[PDB]
From a paper:
Encapsulins are a class of BMCs characterised by their conserved subunit (Enc), which self-assembles to encapsulate enzymatically active cargoes and can remain porous to cargo substrates. The overall structure of Enc subunits across species with different T numbers is conserved and consists of a peripheral domain (P-domain), an axial domain (A-domain), and an extension loop (E-loop). T = 1 encapsulins of Mycobacterium tuberculosis, the causative agent of tuberculosis, and the closely related Mycobacterium marinum, are known to encapsulate the DyP as a core cargo with iron storage ferritin protein (BfrB)28 and FolB as possible secondary cargoes. In vitro cryo-electron microscopy (EM) single-particle analysis of the Mycobacterium tuberculosis encapsulin was used to obtain three structures of the encapsulin shell in intermediate states, as well as a 2.3 Å structure of the fully assembled shell.
Numbering used by the authors:
A (entry chain O), B (entry chain Q), C (entry chain SA): 1 to 265
The structure:
């Protein structure tokens, strides 16, 4: 067995298939970051750091010796525990199709939110700079009126053009901004369609982020490094409940500072 | 023979084909529910209940015995009798093509209305909770002005987005609401087209329901269980008329409470 | 895995084989009901109810609609927990052949007693009418003197003959009555042999029932429906003991009211 200790969990095979399906579905729906960044293959469990290729000056060991430390970025392992009713698990073999997988959905939504907020806003404790912090283009303010959203977005499209950047540009919106441009309409279309006319990429719902992000998806600018992708593991169990977790280990690198514009309220 | 006792009816083969065609046509046109819910294969005549996979605590038979009743949902058999003129039946072999099949059409419309109102509004006596009652998302009020319909509908699309739900969303309208958004026009399109722009599913005419329903058609959320599909059976006959019936047996299950928004006036 | 969670139990393979053998043996010895009634194949875990084929009038949904609920009988799941010493379990691999399987035997005897008392005396909470309650033939009183038992039994054989019934008749006795007709002797035979001369079926020891039952075993009159047959499942464990259970899910149907005579004290 492995670190998931999956065979020790009192979960049947059919219940496991339903839990895997629910977690994978809810996660994909709430991920916006993997649609725009380069996603590496999983390094594996032993992978601990990503080389940046830079060098750090250290106090010379002896006379005439020049020493340099190799710089690297550590992976962070992110774990979201959740708790399942054993009655709901037992219902699945009897043929129930409405078993309560709400904790699985909440854990997948929380893991997806962490991953997206780590990619776009950073996680300083894990030495990850967000796309918002690593952007060299000027930051823009989103207006109160949703009918004035496409104007400011177009100004962001000016800045990537002034930065000398090609590629399909894509706009990612926070859930508040996505709702505002979805529910306001002008001439038989919502403002989301007006945003769709400005770019050759995609208007992407990004419920974890704040504000908005416009960026190129030409490739090679944004890199998500995975040691291991999302997995479900077993912690402990009692007569009534099974404690499990969702787990993934990653770091994020931004190679190109001028490939994005961040917007705030 | 079977319970339809079809060979006992004084109905010719050509008249039977015309009656089957008329009933099937009028039924499909008036069904909205089967276009959005999962429809099972017919279980057969012996099928009487659907297992929910839950358990009900009962008074222990003896000391040290723990007993539980299996929960289930009963099927309901729905029968709509109708009466045909025997002269109209006899006209068909002579080559008439305008035989009065109005009772067949009224029976098919009434059966379709019952089935749709059972799916969406429930039938408490048959222990069926409607989609409106089983929805956990908040209910919305439809405005008087049809030009303000697409706004409220978009708010419903917000709620399924706040519920964490994917899939093609579909809007079902009552006949009053469908007529109102069909006959009012803005900038060369009726408001029905404005509703069509908001979703990737379908604006569906639902003449049996009240208000409106917005819901996902991703699958696995709404399940119509059929023991036997719609069939035409023979009751009795006299010199002038043949009494027949339309009959179907079903139950409806909603597995996912947050997959729909109900709207009312 | 399944709902038994059998691989989670700290029970070795040899100990499992001994427990299965002990439970199966003790159960068969104490079952009288399956020897006389028709026993269906196991429906499976999803099976929840048995269709009776009857209809229940319900308040018409709308005008001109006639509705009927399908009648059914729910299965009941019967669980008898028991507790095993882990030292006795560990003794089996070392080669012990006298490991204390008394709790297994007591659980099998209790499960068998419940099943037989459910078949013959009913379980109202599970909507099961016993053979004694569903019999339309008159009830008889068993006499105090065991030498007068065969007389009354013969009167019961008159009643099935007056009911117009064929087939091998079988007599089932309570443990008190079986002991009384076993230990009293007349002319070199016990009274049990005198009972054996009256029927072409079998004198059957039935320790769970009260009184006596005479009935035909021609087939098709008494039906035991099993969703799942007797199985051993794992609940929980500590350093000293393993909690397990015996479990079976069933209902009982009596189709023929005049196929039996019940006797009481």
């Amino acid at each position: 067995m492995n670190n998931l200790y999956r065979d020790l969990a009192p979960v049947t095979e059919a219940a496991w298939a339903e839990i895997e399906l629910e977690a994978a579905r809810t996660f994909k729906r709430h991920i916006a970051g993997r649609r725009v960044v380069d996603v590496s293959d999983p390094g594996g469990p032993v992978t601990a750091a990503v080389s940046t290729g830079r060098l750090i000056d250290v106090k010379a060991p002896t006379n005439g010796v020049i020493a340099h430390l190799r710089a690297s970025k550590p992976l962070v392992r992110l774990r979201v525990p959740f708790t399942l009713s054993r009655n709901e698990i037992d219902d699945v073999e009897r043929g129930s199709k409405d078993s309560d997988w709400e904790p699985v959905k909440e854990a997948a939504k929380k893991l997806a939110f962490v991953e997206d907020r780590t990619i776009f806003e950073g996680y300083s404790a894990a030495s990850i700079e967000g796309i918002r912090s690593a952007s060299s283009n000027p930051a823009l303010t989103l207006p109160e009126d949703p009918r004035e959203i496409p104007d400011v977005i177009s100004q962001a499209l000016s800045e990537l053009r002034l930065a000398g950047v090609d590629g399909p540009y894509s706009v990612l919106l926070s859930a508040d901004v996505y709702t505002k441009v979805s529910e306001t309409s002008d001439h038989g279309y919502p403002i989301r369609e007006h945003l769709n006319r400005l770019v050759d990429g995609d208007i992407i719902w990004a419920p974890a982020i704040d504000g908005a992000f416009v960026l190129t998806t030409r490739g090679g600018d944004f890199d998500l490094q995975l040691g291991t992708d999302v997995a479900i593991g077993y912690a402990s169990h009692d007569t009534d409940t099974v404690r499990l977790y969702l787990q993934e280990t990653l770091t994020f690198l931004c190679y190109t500072a001028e490939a994005s514009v961040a917007l705030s309220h």
